[PDB]
Design a protein around this ligand. Structure first.
Ligand SMILES: O=S(=O)(Nc1cc(-c2cccs2)nn1-c1ccc(F)cc1)c1cc(C(F)(F)F)cc(C(F)(F)F)c1
Ligand SMILES: O=S(=O)(Nc1cc(-c2cccs2)nn1-c1ccc(F)cc1)c1cc(C(F)(F)F)cc(C(F)(F)F)c1
Lengths: 271, 271
């Protein structure tokens, strides 16, 4: 039944709603200017950032990290903290994908480890326009120009993500489309070191049918959107390998210590 | 609500299975016989010690270096390496505790820094009986009468752990009980130097309620088990102060030591 596929789409939207407080629909209204209530703080330069360490921290001192050290470094570390948070959220959502928790425990672990980054860049696009990105739970907005202005290695971090987002966003996907897409990415039977490939493909098969039916009904006038969407999955992998290269350059060339243990042993045979 | 609290237990039990390779179940299987494999190498004197270390012949080099010392200090070296490795495991599991990674970064660090040792000994009981302890992934045993025999300082190290374990093990906790208990340990709002106490206590509260239900549902005949388990937190805090106490006496009677930088930080300014 098509009814079951819609039931599955529906189940995935609701779990997505619970796992991810800042949804695309909310982020876009923020990025535009709907129901004017509490406009976000704008970080457009080194000075406004300084002025802003005490606009997302000073209220009560519970930050992503302390002061001092280069601004490029501080932003880097703040994004470390932020990604481990994104990961817990993605992990929670994953357990709500039917069949996922019943997979071999270590295949769960492998799936998450290779899948999380592609889900971050997909979902970070919902938070982006062509001019910058919502941060601090939609409380701030950091310009693409400022990120790009940071000294050499760190100024190149974000541009590729911005470039992906602009084009991905032109697809006009809504959270109900993204909910199933994110689930398709998780369940990829081609990740390195997976034990049982077939049960993962059997799940991704059902989520592919659901994704297809979703897009046909929700986006009838977008000829071959399903296909276009699956092709973006190769774009995502590129953004990831490229982000992984740059992290390897940073860690080999820089002089700043003590980092987030999460993706530290996860630096072992990645993308 | 009961179902939230049941899901919390279930969640915590999964990450537990994911972060910790030698669980309590599997370990008692090795101590009992219930397992369909091997039989651990018993170390009781200097000769069977000089047997157990060299026994590494079909079980080659473990994550650690070459045993470039003597007897006591030779174990002193390996257990340091085991500790480092348990910490990694405990850090990984902590990140999976809902709300942990959203806390102030410095309080995450402080919570780990104190909580780690308590969880070490708690989980060390799982691998213990009154006669000795599984070491090396449970491929070895190592009598309490051997460990007790050692030199003036090294002679009071595992004893307090064994005595703790004997009584803790009479509580009949499983892996699913222990999953919640260890989370309640890390989320302790009284650790010195904590910056925002209340959000930590908030989470412990929820964990405490989940512990309660787990015990009540899992051990319905065990009178006041909740209270008796939590009383065990005082015992654990004593083992830690004793441990860290020999670790000082060691700096007066022995020569050069030096620790993995992860253990140096973890023992830094520790009561
Ligand atoms: O995947 S990211 O590009 N990671 C990242 C960016 C940056 C920097 C940008 C500018 C100067 S340093 N650092 N990191 C990062 C992330 C994780 C690490 F382990 C190490 C570094 C990322 C960027 C951002 C943001 F766009 F807001 F910059 C946000 C996140 C979030 F919220 F998902 F955590 C992630
Ligand atoms: O926490 S322990 O008591 N550590 C420890 C024991 C011992 C020794 C006992 C007898 C001679 S040396 N040394 N250490 C130790 C551990 C870490 C340090 F930084 C310094 C010392 C410990 C003992 C054991 C065991 F019983 F196996 F000995 C195992 C572990 C494990 F698995 F948690 F790492 C930890």
């Amino acid at each position: 039944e098509s009814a079951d596929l819609r039931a599955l789409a529906k189940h995935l939207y609701d779990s997505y709603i619970k796992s991810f407080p800042l949804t695309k629909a909310k982020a876009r209204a923020i990025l535009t200017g709907k129901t004017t209530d509490k406009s976000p703080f704008v970080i457009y330069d080194m000075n406004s950032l300084m002025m802003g360490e005490d606009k997302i921290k000073f209220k009560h001192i519970t930050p992503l990290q302390e002061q001092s050290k280069e601004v490029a470094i501080r932003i880097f570390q703040g994004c470390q903290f932020r990604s481990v948070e994104a990961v817990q959220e993605i992990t929670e959502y994953a357990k709500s994908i039917p069949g996922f928790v019943n997979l071999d425990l270590n295949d769960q672990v492998t799936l998450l480890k290779y899948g999380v980054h592609e889900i971050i860049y997909t979902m970070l696009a919902s938070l982006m326009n062509k001019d910058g990105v919502l941060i601090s739970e939609g409380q701030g907005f950091m310009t693409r120009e400022f990120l790009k202005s940071l000294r050499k290695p760190f100024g190149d971090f974000m541009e590729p993500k911005f470039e992906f987002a602009v084009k991905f966003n032109a697809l006009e996907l809504d959270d109900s489309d993204l909910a199933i897409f994110i689930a398709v990415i998780i369940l990829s039977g081609d990740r390195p070191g997976l034990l049982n490939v077939k049960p993962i493909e059997d799940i991704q098969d059902n989520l592919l049918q659901a994704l297809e039916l979703q897009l046909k009904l929700n986006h009838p006038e977008s000829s071959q959107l399903f296909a276009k969407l699956l092709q973006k999955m190769t774009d995502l992998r590129q953004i990831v390998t490229e982000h992984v290269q740059l992290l390897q350059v940073i860690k080999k060339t820089e002089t700043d210590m003590s980092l987030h243990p999460l993706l530290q042993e996860i630096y072992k045979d990645l993308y």
